[PDB]
């Protein structure tokens, strides 16, 4: 609006604005101002040191500047040029700080101090090219509100189910006798208890359950109170702390009857990324081929690279030629390029690796000097192959290879370190850094890997992009970190003895803590401490939980757009790899220029299922077992079966054996079928005639052979078995980087991580005897323990031991239990110091982002492979690339719709109401009232609220019944039971009326809880009418039908890994709080799956590996008769869980990449040419004018149909005056009887408008040419009506 438009010398200030140096000034204005928020040190109960006093006055200086800068621009530009959001928001920052002065000096407010955190966002308006990069994001999130609207409706479903079934179970105590102490055991979180049957016993020797609140963390996960069940469901979906909830419910109610609930939560919580991994990959793959393929920048980019090879290629010959005079100088390529050095320098490097894969923290006397002679020996030889490479190769070309540009910097770092320590006059800090520089010599293997030669190009393409991307990420962290220092301000005081250690009470402490929430590790402890800090779970205090939701949702998604741009890069790395395998092959193309009866047994269906069942019964015999009884009846009945199940299997072997002779063993499958029975022989023989475990383990090899006819190996993982030699490099790439950072870890963290149990002694000699453990910090409640070194169980001593610990960080699990332990390292063998050495955190964060960058890579390799599997059948196309193939699928196949209209005009008057949508909104309303009728159930409430609560549940049940009645009156059940949505509510209605009657009988009990779910289920009627999201699920329902056998692989893991673990990891006595207990048990089978299922979402498998080592108590009902008491646990747990987390997580990605193979077609539908809704719409127009289901429309009403479709597919608004007639004149429309034309002829004529055409002669040849294409696509030779459809569509 540009207020009052005055010229005279404002123009000077206008010309002042257009000067370039405002980039030079004001960029440094922000960057100074963020440092002004860095060292702002918050102090808890109104305290200021000196620096906070000063910079409050310096906050006046920063407010002084922008108050000059902005109102000058209104005089410069005015309000027609503040239409910029970056000018619209920038001012909103400036406006509030001036208001903050006005309030601060009128009183001479607190929340008025935290709006000033937004000042880093002034960088965006200043710095160019970032305004694009944010708009990479906000135009990528918009294809997700059909996916985010699912979880929000799925939470509202899973919150109300929890609030009905679990209302107020968490309240009973485990207190002592008459006092007010909760009774726990040293490590245990105080779990609920119950004094009736079927739950906890509460056997802590001197206790009794009562009322009150011992419930979870500090009051946070009641299943009271709608507003809280929305929290704990949201805690479980992101999969960090859900098994804590399940142990709270199972200890409160009883097991075997909630685990149904939480598993269906996570299988629709693990399903949900499989929406959104591919939901975000949709537009990404689209933008890679609908921005740049519409542009053609890729040919421009690979041309300049092709010239870059010609520049480097032909310059070297000029470089070689003009200088070239010795009997040597050809002894170069005699030696250097020869095959001898390629198998000789590798030896020294592999010796320079095993010069480092020493380093104990003890190193007795040998390796102390043997590594010192190695730096003299191995560096010498290495120098030789430099100096031969320097002189007799060519000096300029040796500095032309980047890979040999690295070798000088090694051999510079080889000698200059070496000549320094000959002096010695230096700090032992300094020589400690120099030993870290010796780990550059591992990077000689990075010049290997031919696979890296595009993985180098994976990086060097994107440095223009991702460094602008990781500027935006590091911005997003510093925004939320400085917000955290104001919302939480070091309010973590508490007055207790527990170390709530992830406080925000610094800047770089807040930075590390904030990062933890992004990785999703342990953000309970962060959040639980946030809400406990303010007052309690309350009305004001609990609302700050949305700082940690928004940090976890908005934070995670921009991390996903980082992923997004990386997948584009390997697609460019695909094309530089694929097209190079054309052009490299084409250069050589220029350089080319009654045993017979037993076969009836092996074929029979009387034999086919009969060997399936004895697998399925041999499975179940392995399923339910004793394994800690040693003599019981279970062992002896099930012992009888598997000997007999060998016997039926034995005839299966012999009847197979007489079929084929010497050429029977040509199958490796056939070799596998035989060695099982051989092992079985001695399994059965040694028992019946007097370590015998291996005979029992290998019975589960029999259920392997079930997938004999399953091609889910032969299609899906065979596609990965193509890329398994590509990912055989890629997994061995990261394992090299898990190797090399282990050696950086060992050079830093030897001997440390070594902590006493009495935290004040720090040293070996000074830490024994006894000491005083205070239960809660009253200095009277004083207890004893012996003290000793707790060597902290994931230690960095040997490089074997290191990689087992960098693995736990790589699964993002317990890295804060390791980082906070890692900071406290002290001298070589000394206990921890509280916040010594804060700088060691940069080691884990660079390590994290490194592997978490690499993680994304492993996933990107998959999706590229998947697309290129679909292409191989599409290369005999001759079509519009699946656009025309869609129209082949639609214009041929699709019949009419169902379209029911009655007679008997009493019945019609019902029918006129039903399809008329005046009451479709009404059921929409009364569902939403039955949300809040179920969404106000507080706890303890009253008898006022109860009397309302029964009455409405009766009244709503009547209305849906009268709905059901009137729908049944018009649509008599042949009509009514056509739609499954009509069927499903009929399941609800009877299920609701029993909920009315069972409520009468208790007015006069488990289904009094259990049938209450039927009020919840009627919310799912909402998805009947939300078209945007109904087809999205429909797509993935159509998917999981198509891939059963891949999901049948993962359950072969759980089945096999349990029965292995069930016979090894029994006998492991179930002491509470030691992470293997009554709820995390190995003993029965079904426990086993949940413990395995706890690993698959990664809920702290860190701990449970440590609970099976060698020193666990042996469950005092089993064995071990004197003395040998603690010896039931083996070191095979290491190779168990580690291989389990690999082969599980891996197999699940093979599931998630497999769902691409169906639904890529859905993900990249052009919503600007012709999608499915249009072709879905056309089926519904027949439901208007052809309600007799004839499949034929008269020629007259064609015209009124073509005006009413929609313009983008049908005809526009200016209609028609010839055009929507002349188009039909310009097409193939036959006439059948009277005047009635079929649908498919009308369907095909309109669809040729979109999939464009030519005139007759070209159409008449197309009537064979599409008939040439479709007869191929008609895989069945039958159906001459399809050819009859082909002439009638051609007519």
């Amino acid at each position: 609006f540009c207020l009052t438009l005055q010229n005279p010398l404002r123009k000077a200030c206008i010309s002042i604005v257009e000067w370039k140096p405002f980039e030079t000034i004001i960029l440094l204005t922000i960057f100074a101002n963020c440092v002004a928020l860095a060292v702002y040190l918050p102090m808890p109960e109104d305290d200021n040191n000196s620096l906070n006093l000063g910079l409050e006055k310096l906050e006046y200086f920063f407010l002084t500047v922008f108050s000059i800068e902005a109102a000058m621009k209104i005089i410069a530009y005015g309000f027609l040029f503040h239409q910029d959001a970056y000018l619209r928001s920038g001012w909103n920052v400036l406006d509030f700080i001036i208001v903050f002065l006005g309030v601060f000096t009128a009183i001479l407010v607190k929340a008025l101090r935290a709006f000033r955190v937004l000042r880093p966002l002034r960088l965006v308006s200043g710095v160019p090219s970032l305004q694009v990069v944010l708009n990479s994001i906000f135009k990528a999130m918009l294809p997700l509100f059909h996916i985010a609207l699912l979880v929000l409706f799925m939470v509202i479903i899973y919150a109300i189910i929890g609030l009905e079934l679990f209302k107020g179970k968490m309240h009973k105590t485990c207190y002592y006798i008459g006092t007010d102490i909760v009774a726990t055991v040293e490590n245990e979180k105080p779990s609920p208890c119950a004094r009736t049957g079927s739950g906890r016993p509460c056997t802590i020797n001197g206790s009794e359950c009562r009322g009150g609140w011992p419930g979870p963390n500090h009051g946070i996960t009641h299943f009271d109170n709608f507003g809280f069940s929305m929290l704990t469901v949201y805690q479980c979906i992101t999969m960090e702390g859900w098994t804590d909830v399940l142990y709270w419910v199972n200890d409160a109610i009883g097991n075997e009857w909630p685990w149904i609930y939480f598993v269906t939560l996570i299988l629709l919580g693990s399903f949900f990324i499989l929406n959104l991994v591919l939901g975000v990959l949709s537009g990404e793959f689209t933008k890679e081929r609908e921005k740049a393929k519409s542009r053609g920048t890729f040919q421009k980019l690979r041309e300049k690279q092709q010239l870059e090879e010609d520049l480097r290629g032909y310059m070297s010959w000029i470089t070689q030629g003009e200088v070239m005079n010795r009997v040597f100088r050809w002894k170069c390529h005699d030696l250097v390029k020869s095959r001898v050095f390629y198998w000789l320098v590798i030896l020294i490097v592999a010796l320079n690796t095993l010069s480092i894969a020493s380093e104990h923290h003890n190193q007795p006397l040998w390796l102390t000097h043997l590594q010192d002679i190695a730096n003299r020996v191995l560096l010498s030889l290495f120098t030789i192959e430099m100096l031969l490479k320097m002189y007799g190769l060519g000096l300029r070309q040796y500095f032309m290879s980047i890979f040999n540009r690295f070798d000088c910097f090694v051999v510079c770092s080889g000698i200059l370190e070496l000549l320094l320590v000959e002096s010695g006059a230096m700090t032992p800090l300094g020589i400690s850094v120099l030993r870290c520089i010796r780990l550059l010599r591992l990077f000689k293997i990075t010049k290997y890997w031919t696979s890296l030669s595009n993985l180098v190009a994976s990086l060097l393409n994107s440095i223009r992009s991702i460094a602008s991307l990781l500027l935006l990420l590091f911005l997003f962290i510093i925004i939320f970190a400085l917000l955290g220092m104001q919302l939480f301000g070091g309010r973590y005081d508490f007055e207790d003895t527990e170390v709530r250690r992830s406080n925000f009470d610094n800047f770089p402490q807040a930075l590390i803590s904030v990062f933890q929430v992004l990785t999703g590790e342990d953000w309970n402890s962060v959040m639980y401490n946030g809400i406990m800090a303010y007052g309690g779970p309350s009305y004001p205090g609990v609302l700050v939980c949305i700082y940690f939701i928004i940090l976890f949702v908005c934070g995670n998604y921009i991390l996903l757009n980082v992923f997004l741009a990386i997948a584009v890069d390997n697609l460019a790395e695909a094309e530089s790899l694929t097209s190079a395998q054309k052009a490299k092959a084409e250069e050589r193309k220029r350089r080319k220029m009654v045993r017979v009866l037993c076969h009836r047994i092996v074929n029979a269906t009387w034999f086919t299922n009969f060997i399936l069942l004895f697998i399925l019964l041999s499975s179940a015999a392995l399923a339910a077992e004793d394994p800690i009884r040693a003599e019981s009846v279970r062992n002896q009945i099930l012992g009888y079966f598997d000997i007999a199940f060998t016997s039926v299997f034995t005839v299966e072997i012999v009847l197979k054996m007489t079929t084929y002779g010497a050429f029977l063993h040509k199958g490796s499958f056939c070799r596998n079928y035989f060695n099982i029975l051989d092992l079985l022989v001695v399994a059965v023989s040694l028992i019946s005639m007097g370590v015998v475990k291996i005979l029992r383990v290998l019975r589960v090899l029999r259920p392997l052979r079930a997938i004999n006819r399953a091609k889910g190996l032969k299609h899906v993982v065979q596609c990965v078995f193509v890329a398994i030699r590509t990912i055989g490099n890629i997994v061995l790439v990261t394992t090299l980087l898990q190797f090399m950072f282990a050696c950086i870890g060992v050079q830093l963290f030897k001997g440390k991580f070594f902590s006493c149990n009495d935290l004040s002694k720090m040293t070996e000699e000074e830490c024994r005897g006894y000491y005083y453990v205070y239960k809660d910090g009253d200095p009277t409640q004083m207890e004893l323990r012996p003290r000793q070194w707790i060597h902290n169980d994931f230690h960095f001593d040997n490089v074997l031991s290191a990689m087992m610990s960098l693995f736990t960080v790589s699964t993002f699990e317990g890295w804060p239990q390791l980082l906070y332990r890692a900071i406290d390292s002290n001298e070589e063998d000394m206990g921890p110091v509280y916040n010594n050495r804060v700088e060691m955190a940069i080691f884990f964060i660079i390590y994290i982002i490194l592997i978490a960058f690499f993680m994304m890579n492993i996933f990107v390799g998959f999706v590229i492979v998947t697309f290129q599997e679909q292409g191989e059948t599409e290369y005999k196309n001759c079509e519009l690339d699946k656009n025309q193939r869609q129209c082949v699928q639609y214009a041929l196949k699709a019949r009419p719709l169902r379209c029911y209209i009655p007679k008997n005009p009493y019945q019609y008057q019902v029918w006129y109401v039903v399809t008329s949508s005046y009451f479709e909104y009404l059921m929409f309303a009364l569902i939403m009232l039955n949300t809040i009728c179920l969404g106000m159930q507080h706890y303890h409430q009253s008898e006022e609220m109860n009397h309302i609560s029964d009455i409405l549940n009766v009244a709503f049940t009547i209305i849906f019944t009268l709905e059901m009645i009137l729908k049944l009156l018009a649509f008599k059940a042949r009509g009514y039971f056509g739609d499954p949505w009509n069927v499903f509510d009929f399941l609800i209605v009877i299920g609701s009326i029993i909920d009315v009657i069972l409520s009468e009988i208790d007015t006069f009990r488990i289904s009094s809880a259990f049938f209450r779910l039927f009020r919840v289920m009627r919310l799912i009627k909402l998805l009947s009418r939300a078209e945007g999201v109904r087809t999205l699920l429909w797509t993935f329902i159509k998917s999981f039908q198509a891939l059963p056998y891949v999901a049948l692989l993962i359950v072969m893991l759980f089945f096999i890994y349990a029965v292995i673990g069930m016979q090894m990891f029994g006998k492991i006595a179930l002491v509470d709080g030691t992470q293997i207990n009554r709820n995390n048990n190995f003993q029965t089978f079904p426990q086993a799956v949940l413990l395995l299922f706890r690993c698959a979402t990664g809920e702290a498998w860190q701990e449970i590996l440590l609970a099976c080592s060698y020193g666990k108590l042996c469950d005092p009902e089993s064995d071990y008769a004197p003395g040998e008491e603690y010896t039931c646990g083996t070191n095979f747990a290491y190779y168990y869980f580690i291989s389990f987390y690999m082969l599980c997580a891996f197999l699940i990605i093979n599931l998630f990449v497999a769902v691409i193979m169906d639904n890529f077609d859905y993900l990249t539908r052009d919503w600007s040419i012709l999608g499915p809704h249009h072709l879905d719409e056309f089926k519904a127009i027949w439901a208007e004018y052809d309600p007799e289901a004839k499949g034929r429309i008269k020629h007259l009403d064609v015209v009124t149909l073509l005006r009413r479709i929609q313009p983008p597919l049908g005809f526009g608004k200016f209609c028609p005056h010839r055009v929507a007639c002349k188009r039909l004149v310009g097409m193939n429309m036959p006439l059948n009887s009277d005047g009635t034309v079929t649908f498919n002829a009308t369907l095909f004529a309109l669809v040729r408008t979109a999939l464009k055409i030519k005139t007759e002669g070209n159409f008449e040849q197309a009537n064979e040419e599409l008939r040439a294409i479709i007869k191929k696509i008609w895989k069945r030779t039958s159906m001459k009506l399809l050819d009859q459809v082909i002439p009638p569509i051609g007519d």
């Binding site: 009736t196 049957g197 079927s198 699928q889 639609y890 196949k893 699709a894 019949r895 719709l897 169902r898 059940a973 042949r974 039971f977 056509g978 739609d979 499954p980 069927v983 009929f986 399941l987 009877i990 299920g991 029993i994 009657i997 069972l998 009988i1001 009990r1005 488990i1006 289904s1007 259990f1010 087809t1031 429909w1034 329902i1037 159509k1038 039908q1041 198509a1042 499915p1172 072709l1175 879905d1176």
Partner: protein, 166 residues
Amino acid sequence: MSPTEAPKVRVTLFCILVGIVLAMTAVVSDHWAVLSPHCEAAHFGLWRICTKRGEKNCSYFSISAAAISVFSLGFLIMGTICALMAFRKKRDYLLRPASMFYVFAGLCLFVSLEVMRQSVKRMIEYYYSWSFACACAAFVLLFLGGISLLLFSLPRMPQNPWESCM
């Protein structure tokens, strides 16, 4: 036709007709569990509690367990009606509500299973008996037997989006 004439709706119907009589057997059967005080050993029943030391003595006293099971037979009565009519007029669609009632009837027996389990904890040994395993087998055959009949009644999601829900 082929909904009715697939044998998979004939296999799953007959094994429901197993559990229908099995549930009907657990209607009358008074041997849910054994009273064992240590004699007045007795049997908790849906209708009458019979006590034996042969000096056998039937009596009664726990009330809603019969009445909840009264609806359970009443579904099975009503669930045979539309299922029998679903054969003889080529009316296919009545397999749907016949499957509906067969779902709920085993569900109400589960209620009485908990209600009789509730009668144990109120109180002398209680051991479960053969009529308990009558119902817990009758539960599964009416629950899992119904839904497979229900889902095979409903057509497919067919494979490919040009036919949906007809």
